[PDB]
């Protein structure tokens, strides 16, 4: 997967999504700094905050280059607060748009770019998918974004082999981690920008070292590692 | 199909199209006074102009009732301008979005309820789908919406079985037809409705009666008979 | 939602599922004897025993009329054990192909037609998707087919509104639940058919009354009835 | 695109389709030698001919790795004839199942590999679709698949940077184009296989040359210059 967040002045999501040069519509096809997974076709989401701070979405399970509805009516979705994502589906999980990111607990939109063994994670009855991503979304929203930090670090723990990038947002605020793969920041005169990469080569894009948590809010840009459980 | 159109003050997708108690949602799996077709399921289509008055499209080949992202998106989309419709497919016509009204040539946006032999329209290369709906848009834009009222009539004499209404809108004015199918106006104090069917019982509702074209702008109504 | 089963001779997907005169096609758009739902346009599924007694699916989230691909190859598929069935997604449930029946987990294909409240089942890592069907679909896998009532009378104490209408196959048996909603059977020469609504207007449909299980195999059809559960 | 056909011995879907190393389900993420497209992930097709010799499609407008339903039940589906396809949308032509190949009249199953300006094509009132795959199907249709080389090279004429790979088949007879794009052959000891490129490594593969057609019948393979 690939995501991208922003917060900030309104902005469109064809302008955050499509219309950057090597932004997340590129991306779909040809990521750059993506070690697991060649493409990113397995659908795709675009969730944002509107003028009262109601989170709404859209998903797809399909391809976001072939999407003409969303090509049409992005330029014309203005939001302070986008998060997005492109899929990449891991093997023998469900391609279905309720398995694509943003998932929702109608507060928090949250996308997962890694992968987690399911059996490390509780059972529960409150997910959106079977897809493992929203199995730790669910844990994750349980415990309260607040917490992301201590609940990624467990899971970490409890599976050595996962990868547990998170990329969330509530209207007012970003929380993401690294944990397994990318993320780079933006600081723009009217906003902040967190992406798995950088959607141009603009020289202000800064990397995000691993196991970290990143915490954008009142124009503050916070970073704190996140260490190991044991 | 049904379909209905919005010319006035911004209105949301969703007040217009979701929200009302008998709109186009509740028409997809139970409509009112459609004659032709006990749903419209096999697709839908939202087509509105934005601020800049640049037309824009969301269609769709599954039913409405179902569609999750439009349920949650369609009320932060506003719009001075809006042409909508739910797709009861013809059989032999394909299932596909680009199939679901409405269609567009950038400028004007149509919508199409009815039925019409492709064989009395012209062949054509711009056409957005094989559906005779499209065909006959390609005809409609092709001659003008300045003629969409003689197009229609002479489509109708061609084929007398045809069934030929027409909704369509520019952004600042509405056309319609009726041609053996149902429409209705209401007006409101911030605009003006143009509907396949009336969405609620509000007695401002006024029936168009069959073979006129409708002209909408500036907070006028003109209606007036298609001749032969 | 409706679903309906066949075991006995090869018999062709189109043969049981869309060329009847009022079978489950006709049923996506107009079903006869549906209390719940005005149709079942919210997708469809068809599954399986092939010669080597392996079950194959075909689902989909699109209704059933209008699916070209499988009016077209449906007629080429035949079976010995076919558990087919058309949806009326529940509001609030995802609409999604692994949202619609036939669920299995490989010795079994498995059709819910009704509702139960998720919050009365056990969580579970086994579902093949967050429906109630699905849910409920894991519960009765891993209680074991020979179980089956006794799930389903369980179930029905702890959500009292339920509706729990289970259509079942293994390749060589059919097993069936009424609770809350219709079924019917047909016996003919070369087999036995299990259905929401029967596909045609054959004297010899029977309607299986309420709260029984139906135990089709051997070319036998045993009816019996189930019990409530008060514990 | 790519595509693949066989004829001979019934062969099922998925042996054909999905279960060879580097076939059309690899094809359509991870082609090996596809000079137009990164991947084919914008729809496919299998049509087939049954027993009675009735032609039969399964088409689709989403990426053949992610289809569950074909994955389940394509071994089981045999056939002596088949044609199938992933596709590479060009951008701009409408994604949806029936602008994906294969194209049928009823009698012969089409796939085209390539791109042609609709406007050197006559207007139609019988394509699938309006993609231009469809409206050049229309034509190859109308002036009958024994006409295919005059059909190719005409249109070839008419739009220079067309590129024009046809593989279409009716059930005991395969015919192929090469016009800009790539096809190879295999002869096995139960029939032949057409496709855009080599589903593995058998050594048996031969590549076609460009401007030829391809003609496979009571097995035999006939390999003309198109001029
Ligand atoms: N590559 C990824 O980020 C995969 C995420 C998740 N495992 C999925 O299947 O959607
Ligand atoms: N009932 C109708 O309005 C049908 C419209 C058109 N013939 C179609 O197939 O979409
Ligand atoms: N009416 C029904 O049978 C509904 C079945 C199940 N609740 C679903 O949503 O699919
Ligand atoms: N690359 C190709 O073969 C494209 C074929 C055709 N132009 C299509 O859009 O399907």
Redesign the interface.
Known sequence: CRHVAWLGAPRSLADLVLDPPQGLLVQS??PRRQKHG??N??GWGAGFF??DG?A????????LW?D??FA??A???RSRCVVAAVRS?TIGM?????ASAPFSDGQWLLSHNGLVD??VLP???A????VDSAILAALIFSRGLDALGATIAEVGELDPNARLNILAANGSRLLATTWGDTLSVLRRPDGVVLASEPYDDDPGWSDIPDRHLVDVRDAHVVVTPLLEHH
């Open positions: 096809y040809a060649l493409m076709a397995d509107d003028d109601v709404r979405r859209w998903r797809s399970d399909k391809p072939g003409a509805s049409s009516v330029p014309a979705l589906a469900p391609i279905e748009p309720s399911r059996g059972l529960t009855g997910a959106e998918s079977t």
